[PDB]
């Protein structure tokens, strides 16, 4: 592990505060602009959709990435939510109500057992089984997110290889000739302090760079900063053009 | 099926000739600018990397997408070929020597049997074990490519679901918030007429559009047209922005 304070400039150019954590898989070395924040545990919010997806698939709650989950008919504030979705779109649009139904079906006993198996954050599911990742007791740090992701990347999680592959497919966010990004955004607004998350990895031709970032998010206006800052760090480090 | 000759404009604008075939999965409808050419069988060239990959994986020739195939030390014309590769990179850069090795390991009996199971093209492997797809008897049409691709998308091909999933991952070409493209390029140069191919699918939020195209390609200089012309068709059909 190494601290590289220079990345703070990317946060400060925006009158922002946060942490970005990178892990060079080939070299087995990590980097961050704030080792302490890197280790600070927060509510995962939508980043919980990764483990939630894995558990639902492994248990058969979700058959495959094509099964459609009908809109429940309640008009919510995010337009994209008011439609039918499959696993790929539910993740893409961070569709809470679909994931809430997955959690309810999985149930508290299975959820807790799986999180323990996953070694995920504090492994705590107190609160509602369908909202703990939002207003409950689960907590996870950026380094912890990296550890979880590495296991997923290597198919080492305690679920089927198939489930892991489907989830990794679902995580696809951007791709071109230069790189592939598999990731998940997060936005915690129920319990202070409000924060934004971006976690995942960058696949290159001969390496993979895992990343986990979070930043203070007082308002929604700064949401795009989650990707923008992470990318600036990635550019500075020559990981992406 | 239905013919739409307006697409010819895209080809003519470049002093080019070819065919683009599209299949709307949701509607179960096909479209092409040239029905006859859509059904004409040509050497698959590098598009053969899709079946080749599936077979190698299913038979254990290739253990996973991470296994490294060391450069043989011979300096070839394509710089990207002169390095170690894995299944993802080999597919991405169309690294023939890697695929040739797979082909030799697989052998003629297994290859023929697998192609018969896949219902792939004319199913004829007559020619060199490590080059039939380049200068042998195998032939496949654009419509035939789409038939094959649909099975692959649905995990219906005779081989393991795992094998199909890995190959679809390897096929990843481009992605963003609007669409995902899984595809493979090809350039048949050994037997006239020389042609360029691009086959795959475009994954949308609510549908998938399969595609198969080929065009006359006298020189490698026009290789970029394969993607560019395809994209014009997609834009014209409102599939992509
Ligand atoms: Cl993928
Ligand atoms: Na596994
Ligand atoms: Na024909």
Swiss-Prot record, chains A, B:
Keyword Ribosomal protein attached: no
Protein name as catalogued: Beta-lactamase OXA-48
Organism taxonomic ancestry: Bacteria, Pseudomonadati, Pseudomonadota, Gammaproteobacteria, Enterobacterales
One GO CC annotation: plasma membrane
Family of the protein in this entry: Belongs to the class-D beta-lactamase family.
Oligomeric form and interacting partners: Monomer. Dimer.
Highest taxon above the source species: Bacteria
Activation and inhibition: Inhibited by chloride, bromide and iodide ions. Not inhibited by the beta-lactamase-blocking agents, clavulanic acid or tazobactam.
Impact after mutating residue 165 to A: No significant effect on catalytic efficiency with respect to ampicillin. Very little reduction in dimerization at neutral pH. Predominantly monomer at neutral pH. Slightly decreases thermal stability
Protein EC: 3.5.2.6
Induction remark: Expressed from an upstream promoter, P(out), in an insertion sequence IS1999.
The UniProt record lists the keyword Methyltransferase: no
Effect recorded for residue 182 to A: No significant effect on catalytic efficiency with respect to ampicillin, nitrocefin or imipenem. Very little reduction in dimerization at neutral pH. Predominantly monomer at neutral pH. Slightly decreases thermal stability
Molecular functions per Gene Ontology: beta-lactamase activity; penicillin binding
PTM: Carboxylated on the epsilon-amino group of a lysine, with the resulting carbamate functional group serving as a general base. Probably N-carboxylated at Lys-49 at neutral pH in vivo and undergoes complete N-decarboxylation, at pH 4.1, in vitro.
């Amino acid at each position: 592990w190494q601290e590289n304070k220079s990345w703070n400039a990317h946060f400060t150019e925006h009158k922002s505060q946060g942490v970005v954590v990178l892990w060079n898989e080939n070299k087995q070395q990590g980097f961050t602009n704030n080792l302490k924040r890197a280790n600070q545990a927060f509510l995962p919010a939508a980043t919980f959709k990764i483990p939630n997806s894995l558990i639902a698939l492994d248990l058969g709650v979700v058959k495959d990435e094509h099964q459609v989950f009908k809109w429940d008919g309640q008009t919510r504030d995010i337009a994209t939510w008011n439609r039918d979705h499959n696993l790929i779109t539910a993740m893409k649009y961070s569709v809470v109500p679909v994931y809430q139904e997955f959690a309810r079906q999985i149930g508290e006993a299975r959820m807790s057992k799986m999180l323990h198996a996953f070694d995920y954050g504090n492994e705590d599911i107190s609160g509602n089984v369908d909202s703990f990742w939002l207003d409950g007791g689960i907590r996870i740090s950026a380094t912890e997110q990296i550890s979880f992701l590495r296991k997923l990347y290597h198919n080492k999680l305690h679920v089927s290889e198939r489930s892991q592959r489907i989830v990794k497919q679902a995580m696809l966010t951007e791709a071109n000739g230069d790189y592939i990004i598999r990731a998940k955004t997060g936005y915690s607004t129920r319990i202070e302090p409000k924060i934004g998350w971006w976690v995942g990895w960058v696949e290159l031709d001969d390496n993979v760079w895992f990343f986990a970032m979070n930043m203070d998010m007082p308002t929604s206006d700064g949401l795009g900063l989650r990707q923008a800052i992470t990318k600036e760090v990635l550019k500075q480090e020559k990981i992406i053009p």
